[PDB]
Amino acid sequence: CSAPCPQDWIWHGENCYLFSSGSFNWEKSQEKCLSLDAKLLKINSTADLDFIQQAISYSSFPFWMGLSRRNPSYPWLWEDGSPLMPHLFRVRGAVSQTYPSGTCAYIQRGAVYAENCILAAFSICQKKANL
Amino acid sequence: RVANCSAPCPQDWIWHGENCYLFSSGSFNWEKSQEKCLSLDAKLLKINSTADLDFIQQAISYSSFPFWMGLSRRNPSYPWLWEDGSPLMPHLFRVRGAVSQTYPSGTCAYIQRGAVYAENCILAAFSICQKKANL
Numbered sequence: 001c002s003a004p005c006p007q008d009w010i011w012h013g014e015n016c017y018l019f020s021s022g023s024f025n026w027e028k029s030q031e032k033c034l035s036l037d038a039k040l041l042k043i044n045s046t047a048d049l050d051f052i053q054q055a056i057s058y059s060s061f062p063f064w065m066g067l068s069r070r071n072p073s074y075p076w077l078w079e080d081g082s083p084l085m086p087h088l089f090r091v092r093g094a095v096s097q098t099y100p101s102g103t104c105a106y107i108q109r110g111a112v113y114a115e116n117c118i119l120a121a122f123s124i125c126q127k128k129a130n131l
Numbered sequence: 132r133v134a135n136c137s138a139p140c141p142q143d144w145i146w147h148g149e150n151c152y153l154f155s156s157g158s159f160n161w162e163k164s165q166e167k168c169l170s171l172d173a174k175l176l177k178i179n180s181t182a183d184l185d186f187i188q189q190a191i192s193y194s195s196f197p198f199w200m201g202l203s204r205r206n207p208s209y210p211w212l213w214e215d216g217s218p219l220m221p222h223l224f225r226v227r228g229a230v231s232q233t234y235p236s237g238t239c240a241y242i243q244r245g246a247v248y249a250e251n252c253i254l255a256a257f258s259i260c261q262k263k264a265n266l
Contacts, residue, residue: 001136008186011138019193028168055155058194058257091141122193 004129011129012051017041017064018125019056026117029064030043030079034126040066041107041124042078043088046112052124060109064123067091067105067112071098076105139264146264147186152176153260154190154198161239165214166201166257175201176259177213178242184223187259189244195244200256202240203251204230211240 005016006041020032033040043049053067056063066079076084076091093113104117107124114122153173155164170176178184178200187224191198201214207230211219219226228249230238238254250256 003146004138005146007148008189010145011140011142013142053142055154056193057156058154058196058198060195061193106155 002130004131010055013048014131015126016129017052017055020123020125022120023120023122025101026064026068026122027101030066033123036125036127038125038127039055039079040064041126042066042080042082046088049088052107056107056124056127062106062108062113062115062121063119064104064106065112068117070102070104072096072103085124087124137265138266140173140262145190148180148182149264149266150183151192151262151264152186155258155260157221158196158255158257161199161252161258162236164256165201167258168201168260171260171262171263173260174214175199176242176261177201177215178223181223187242191242191245194257197241197243197248197250197256199239199241199256200247202226203252204238204245206232206237208229 005011009016009018019028024032030040041052065078067084069076074094089112089113091114093115094103097116099116102117103114105114106113106121140146142153144153165175166197176246178187179208201213202219204211211226224247226240226247226249236252238249240249241256
């Protein structure tokens with residue numbers, strides 16, 4: 001018998017969620033989730049979105065999620081190469097631009113926005129809960 | 132009925148050390164915040180150890196918001212008391228700011244950016260509930 005999640009994480013449904021300790025570019029944030037046996041946030045449902053917004057409701061920080069694209073001719077995809085399911089959210093912000101290191105999505109103050117991947121943000125990591 | 136593998140804390144709470152913590156998702160007055168914790172068979176935050184303080188300081192570092200704790204002072208002639216009736220010990224913090232007889236329902240304490248302040252209990256803030264972890 002092990003706890004579903006380590007101390008300091010939030011257990012929700014099948015997963016465990018953690019806010020990153022620091023603010024880094026998307027690539028570094030991805031590496032830091034991987035080091036914790038985790039991945040960047042993947043939103044599969046509006047229930048997941050509502051859970052995350054309630055968890056970040058007290059923060060004004062931007063948090064990277066695992067969604068990115070090279071440029072606007074590419075669809076948004078999660079780190080695992082799966083697609084963004086429809087009717088979850090509309091990515092706002094910098095959606096028409098091409099950045100040398102791609103465009104990445106973050107959640108901030110109740111909405112999802114596109115940004116240049118080289119800029120810094122906090123991030124949310126997630127991993128499967130031990131059930 | 133007897134659990135196969137009891138989790139330390141319920142879903143949506145955060146486990147740290149001996150306790151479970153539940154951060155609110157909105158701002159409410161102290162009485163409504165107290166009621167919410169009681170409804171869950173829990174209580175408002177009681178920072179009683181260095182482990183509790185270190186955890187809360189890190190968790191609230193993502194926020195500029197105030198979070199009510201379970202500490203209040205009926206009127207300036209009375210002491211600060213936790214919801215359990217115990218006194219405020221001087222080890223971890225003092226409550227900064229004003230206590231006033233003009234406040235209709237006493238003065239309450241909140242933690243904000245690591246420090247603890249006094250405020251009129253009828254004002255709205257985020258809050259934190261706590262209960263013992265099932266270890």
